Write a protein that binds this ligand. Structure first.
Ligand code: CHL
Ligand code: CHL
Ligand code: CHL
Ligand code: CHL
Ligand code: CHL
Ligand code: CHL
Ligand code: CLA
Ligand code: CLA
Ligand SMILES: CC1=C[C@H](O)CC(C)(C)[C@H]1/C=C/C(C)=C/C=C/C(C)=C/C=C/C=C(C)/C=C/C=C(C)/C=C/C1=C(C)C[C@H](O)CC1(C)C
Ligand SMILES: CC1=C[C@H](O)CC(C)(C)[C@H]1/C=C/C(C)=C/C=C/C(C)=C/C=C/C=C(C)/C=C/C=C(C)/C=C/C1=C(C)C[C@H](O)CC1(C)C
Lengths: 221, 221, 238, 219
């Protein structure tokens, strides 16, 4: 069981996964568990673009799953900055003094969403287009894992643990995408923060769960 | 008569469909009307996975349409249920007195939705891992039409009419899938049961059609 | 391949796989599919072979045939017991005036005033003395149980467990070979069920002290309060 | 010692002829004690070895599961009912079966559902013992390995056989202790560490001979 590659590997149905795992999923990629029940990635070009899209979704979801928990995690310590939930965090731009980073007034404290939006558009278009094509840190390399200045700490060498950390990255990333979809729907249905949902679940699990909010979206008409 | 296999068969545009059918839909599979105008199943393994998805969707939608029609018909005939309408039949577990199956308190009397969901997760994971791999009701079998434990009445024998029964299964399954989508959208925009909407459309069909609810989800508010 | 009426088993002429599930290596076992290593001496040629010799007491074949003898004799005695334990209670709930219809107190009926009324009737048996009853029992049972092992007036050279001559198969159910081999495993399965139920009668009489049909009625009335666990606090050591 | 013809035996220095010829020193704890000859046949020997080791491990698990609520009653958590021959009555209480005296940890109410879940898990894990499963497949049914040894202490075969004889000796001592718990629960009526507290209070009166009279019939 100590492998994430080869023909025999950990799979998404466990011991129920011999009749699954078709011929074009061979375990040659980080995170192959034989889950292609829909059959979306038969073509290896389609499979390559889906793997790239999945891994950049993994990176942005690992960024997001921590950036949504840290405002409520510093509201746990008692640092007050406007609002601690993530899905009502943008409106602090439109506050009486603007969105503050850590609440202390000598910090970022920007007020106009349109100017920082334009700055985000230009530098993120430049950075992501350098990610797709190439720029001043590597022109033609892997579209998945460039390295170079992306590994200043030297974890890209010794390629077996590079593959092992690739599987670790895609596993934590898939857990982060699952967590971020759960964050989205806990924001939609409950309307409170996810750490607040954790406090309400730890305070009373048996009556306050998702089935408590099961009758919310019932169409009355 | 009209056939459903071969080079000429029943097609999706009817008589205006001899140029319309794609090349890969040669008609060896049940329910091949040649409707792949978006080209989702041009690869044959994507087509195989989509056939499995369509047939399992078809069987679950047939069960779901029968279960959406059944307690409403029994309520309009004789039987006082807990909540016979299907999109409010879930919250009967929160009716403070149990979930009576046929309305009688001598029946299953369920009060805990977490245990009900948990035994459903256990039994459904077992049965679907049996469906994709094998188990006590057949090990090496067809993943979509196993037989010899799901045909105790022997209707898959004489395979020339087993092909006709495959086409009948996929056609009632596609009609039930369409009807389940109609059940969903009718539940969203009418708030009453499908049989209550049927009684409404049978009372006054000129204004109990869909266009009376056309201004309901208006973009102004 | 096979049509609907053959799967239901309409035709009892073409049934040759009936003994395949109770004899031979492709038979049912004790833990079902969770019993892989069948004991290699329990090859399934005897009735009731579910592959169960977990304590290993029947590895030697002589000990195995003596245990088969003991099993069938205990099976038939417990079958007669479990029929003869409930039927006084069944006929008392019918309305026949049996004065102590529970089986664990029926032996004390012979110490009453009027002796042992059989069906509650003095026109019946009306046995008074326990001494002459046990004397004619030990004489009759000595004669019968001594005729059992080496033959006697109802068969001499017949089988020690299944004689089946003109006295022990008078109705003639076991004339056919396959019917005899099927009713052998039917007999030993009903006998193991009745042995288990007679052990249940013993333990139920010990820890409750009421009738088995009274126990059945007190479980039918309250299943969840009046189970075996409400009497689990009756042998607490103080 | 502990294996071969020159191993530790059950009589010791007086154990050169009473040991049976078929108890040769290859199986763990073969002290040569078959004074009734019940394991003369090799299939009886193998089945009795299986029964002995399974009874051994069930007995040591039962010994710790019986005495650890007593040691925690010494430690300070009260329990629903610390006494092991009165421990089944926690689920008959009003508050239910709290595990460590915590009402929000187990809080079991239905003894019938406890027995149902217990038999549904235990029949499966006892039938998996016979013919493999998700843990193993076709190993030694007494010493499986490879899924129940996450640390894997069965590497060196000499130390493996040493741990085997240590296990079976602790197991015979455990079945001895559980038989003692059984027959000193019924004659005293107090918990076993509580009987240790009696025997340490006064060692010459709080013995088994203080209660050696109570089982006379006396009409
Ligand atoms: C791309 C990631 C991203 C996400 C997920 C959000 C999320 C949100 N922003 Mg937002 N923003 C994001 C980027 C940015 N925002 C802003 C500036 C603001 C402002 C000023 C405000 C918001 C507000 C909001 C919230 C609207 C409340 C609502 O309608 O709840 C319903 C929605 C949910 C509960 C989440 C559901 C998830 C969604 C349906 C699926 C996610 C997939 C997306 C469709 C794809 C993302 C878009 C792509 C193309 C980039 C919403 C949760 C408002 C707010 O917080 O006040 C209430 C607000 O005032 N944002 C900037 C400029 C710096 C961004 C640039 O990166
Ligand atoms: C997967 C199929 C499935 C469907 C279609 C439904 C349907 C529903 N359940 Mg239900 N359930 C389903 C599974 C289960 N439910 C329950 C137990 C409950 C309870 C306790 C309750 C519900 C309630 C509801 C209703 C939510 C009210 C609403 O938002 O209406 C608006 C939405 C619709 C009318 C249509 C929604 C369908 C969706 C948009 C499209 C279909 C996509 C699939 C659902 C996703 C696929 C699922 C996958 C993971 C298998 C909704 C009609 C609530 C209710 O009825 O109370 C009034 C409620 O209290 N369900 C269990 C555990 C036994 C399930 C396990 O399988
Ligand atoms: C695959 C699942 C499966 C399981 C789990 C079992 C289980 C069993 N079958 Mg089997 N079977 C199974 C499949 C099948 N069986 C059979 C046909 C048979 C037959 C004919 C027989 C069995 C018997 C047995 C038992 C043999 C072992 C034993 O005696 O345990 C004994 C130990 C326990 C049951 C556990 C102890 C009970 C309790 C949970 C613990 C104690 C509780 C108390 C509160 C303790 C307090 C007491 C104090 C005072 C000391 C065992 C219970 C035999 C039997 O019925 O023996 C009783 C038997 O004669 N099975 C068929 C048909 C081919 C099967 C098909 O799949
Ligand atoms: C050299 C002297 C020596 C002798 C004579 C023995 C003999 C014995 N060893 Mg031992 N060993 C000896 C040295 C050694 N042994 C061992 C290794 C072992 C092991 C591993 C084991 C033994 C065991 C035993 C016992 C087995 C016989 C038995 O069960 O008692 C039968 C006789 C009695 C039980 C009489 C009891 C005395 C008293 C009369 C009881 C009171 C009766 C009640 C009042 C009556 C009950 C009343 C009613 C209500 C029922 C016995 C005490 C076994 C054991 O512990 O079993 C219990 C065991 O497992 N020995 C080693 C290491 C090499 C030794 C070193 O020299
Ligand atoms: C096979 C191991 C086993 C043994 C030897 C016992 C034996 C015992 N149980 Mg126990 N049980 C066992 C397993 C189980 N019990 C129970 C459920 C109970 C209950 C509810 C009670 C006992 C009680 C008792 C005790 C009273 C009998 C006695 O003579 O003193 C004694 C400790 C009684 C007790 O503890 O006295 C108050 C009691 O009330 N047991 C379950 C759950 C199904 C078990 C699981 O296998
Ligand atoms: C994967 C499911 C599974 C679980 C949860 C258990 C759990 C258990 N096994 Mg089992 N077993 C399981 C599968 C298997 N066991 C065994 C062979 C054994 C043995 C020999 C023993 C256990 C024992 C045990 C107990 C504690 C061991 C820790 C517990 C009842 C021990 C026991 O019951 O002693 C008290 C014990 O000695 N199991 C095999 C054969 C390789 C299995 C294969 O699937
Ligand atoms: C949008 C994100 C995304 C994308 C593009 C992919 C893409 C891929 N995954 Mg990954 N995966 C994801 C999210 C994603 N996955 C998440 C969140 C999980 C954890 C649950 C996994 C777990 C996973 C495993 C275990 C494996 C893959 C594999 C694969 C490959 C083949 C399967 C396929 O065709 O998927 C195509 C997927 C998409 C086109 C995304 C469609 C998104 C739709 C809208 C989701 C709809 C479902 C539902 C509405 C939302 C979730 C419901 C519920 C689960 C909460 C492919 C590269 C397999 C592989 O080959 O390894 C590399 C494999 O073994 N993935
Ligand atoms: C229901 C349990 C049962 C079954 C299926 C069998 C089956 C068999 N027995 Mg066994 N037997 C049983 C119970 C059973 N016996 C008991 C309890 C006794 C002791 C009284 C015996 C004593 C016995 C002997 C001495 C012999 C058999 C023989 C036979 C075989 C042929 C007779 C037959 O088919 O009976 C079928 C059984 C039934 C249809 C059950 C009917 C139950 C009736 C209706 C109730 C009557 C109860 C009655 C009052 C009890 C007192 C007598 C067959 C293998 C003979 C044999 O092997 O011949 C080759 C043979 O020699 N058996
Ligand atoms: C062909 C083609 C071609 C081209 O190329 C492209 C395109 C266009 C894309 C395509 C198309 C497609 C389509 C049409 C789709 C659709 C689908 C559906 C509708 C499904 C359903 C599906 C559906 C389904 C399954 C359903 C199921 C159901 C169920 C189970 C139910 C259940 C229930 C009931 C009983 C009642 C209760 O009280 C509750 C509940 C729980 C609610
Ligand atoms: C198989 C195996 C295997 C593994 O390996 C091992 C082991 C475990 C060891 C094994 C097991 C075994 C067992 C289970 C046993 C059991 C038995 C029984 C229970 C019997 C009964 C048994 C039972 C019996 C006989 C019973 C009988 C009965 C009789 C006579 C009669 C009675 C009566 C009656 C009518 C009533 C009246 O009023 C009186 C009287 C007189 C009282």
């Amino acid at each position: 069981a100590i492998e994430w590659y080869g023909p025999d590997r950990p799979k998404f149905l466990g011991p129920f996964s011999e009749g699954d795992t078709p011929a074009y999923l061979t375990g040659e990629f980080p995170g192959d568990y034989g889950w292609d029940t829909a059959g979306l990635s038969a073509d290896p070009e389609t499979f390559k673009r889906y793997r790239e899209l999945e891994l950049i979704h993994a990176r942005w979801a690992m960024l997001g799953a921590l950036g949504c928990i840290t405002p409520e995690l510093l509201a746990k310590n008692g640092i007050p900055f406007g609002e601690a939930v993530w899905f009502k965090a943008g409106a602090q731009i439109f506050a009486e003094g603007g969105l503050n980073y850590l609440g202390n007034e000598n910090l970022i404290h920007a007020q106009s969403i349109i100017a920082t939006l334009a700055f985000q558009v230009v530098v993120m278009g430049l950075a992501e287009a350098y990610r797709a094509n190439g720029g001043p840190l590597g022109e033609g390399l892997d579209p998945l894992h460039p390295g170079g200045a992306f590994d200043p700490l030297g974890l890209a060498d010794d390629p077996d643990t590079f593959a092992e950390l690739k599987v670790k990255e895609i596993k934590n990333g898939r857990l982060a995408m699952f967590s971020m979809f759960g964050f989205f729907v806990q924001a939609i249905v409950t309307g409170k923060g996810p750490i607040q949902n954790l406090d309400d679940h730890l305070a009373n699990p048996t009556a306050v769960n998702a089935f408590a909010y099961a009758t919310k979206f019932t169409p009355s008409a | 008569g009209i056939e459903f296999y071969g080079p000429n068969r029943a097609k999706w545009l009817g008589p205006y469909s001899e140029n319309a059918t794609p090349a890969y839909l040669t008609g060896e599979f049940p329910g091949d009307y040649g409707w792949d105008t978006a080209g989702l199943s041009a690869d044959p393994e994507t087509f195989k996975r989509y056939r499995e998805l369509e047939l399992i969707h078809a069987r679950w939608a047939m069960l779901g349409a029968l279960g959406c029609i059944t307690p409403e018909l029994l309520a309009k005939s004789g039987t006082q249920f807990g909540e016979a309408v299907w999109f409010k039949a879930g919250a009967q577990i929160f009716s403070e007195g149990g979930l009576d199956y046929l309305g009688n308190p001598s029946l299953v009397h369920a009060q805990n939705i977490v245990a009900t969901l948990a035994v459903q997760v256990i039994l459904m994971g077992l049965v679907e891992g049996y469906r994709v791999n094998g188990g006590p009701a057949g090990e090496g079998l067809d993943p979509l039409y196993p037989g010899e434990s799901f045909d105790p009445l022997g209707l898959a024998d004489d395979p020339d009419t087993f092909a006709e029964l495959k086409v009948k299964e996929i056609k009632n399954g596609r009609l039930a899938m369409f009807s389940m989508f109609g059940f969903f959208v009718q539940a969203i925009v009418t708030g009453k049961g499908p049989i209550q909407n049927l009684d409404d459309h049978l009372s006054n069909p000129t204004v109990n059609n869909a266009f009376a609810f056309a201004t309901k989800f208006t973009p102004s508010a | 391949k096979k049509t609907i009426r053959e799967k239901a088993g309409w035709w009892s002429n073409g049934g040759n796989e009936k003994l395949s599930a109770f004899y031979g290596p492709d038979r049912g076992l004790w833990l079902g599919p969770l019993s892989g290593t069948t004991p290699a001496y329990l090859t399934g040629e005897f009735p009731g072979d579910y592959g169960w010799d977990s304590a290993g007491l029947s590895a030697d074949p002589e000990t195995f045939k003596r245990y088969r003898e003991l099993e069938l004799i205990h099976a038939r005695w417990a079958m007669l017991g479990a029929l003869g334990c409930i039927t006084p209670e069944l006929l008392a709930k019918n309305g026949t005036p049996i004065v102590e219809p529970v089986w664990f107190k029926a032996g004390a009926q012979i110490f009453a005033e009027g002796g042992l009324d059989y069906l509650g009737n003095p026109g019946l048996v009306h046995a008074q003395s326990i001494l002459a009853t046990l004397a004619v029992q030990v004489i009759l049972m000595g004669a019968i149980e001594g005729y059992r092992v080496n033959g006697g007036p109802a068969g001499e050279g017949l089988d020690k467990l299944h004689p089946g001559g003109q006295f022990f198969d008078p109705l003639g159910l076991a004339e056919d070979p396959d019917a005899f081999a099927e009713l052998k495993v039917k007999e030993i399965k009903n006998g193991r069920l009745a042995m288990f139920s007679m052990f249940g009668f013993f333990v139920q009489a010990i820890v409750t002290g009421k009738g088995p049909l009274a126990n059945l009625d007190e479980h039918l009335a309250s299943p969840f309060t009046s189970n075996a666990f409400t009497y689990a606090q009756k042998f607490t050591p103080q």
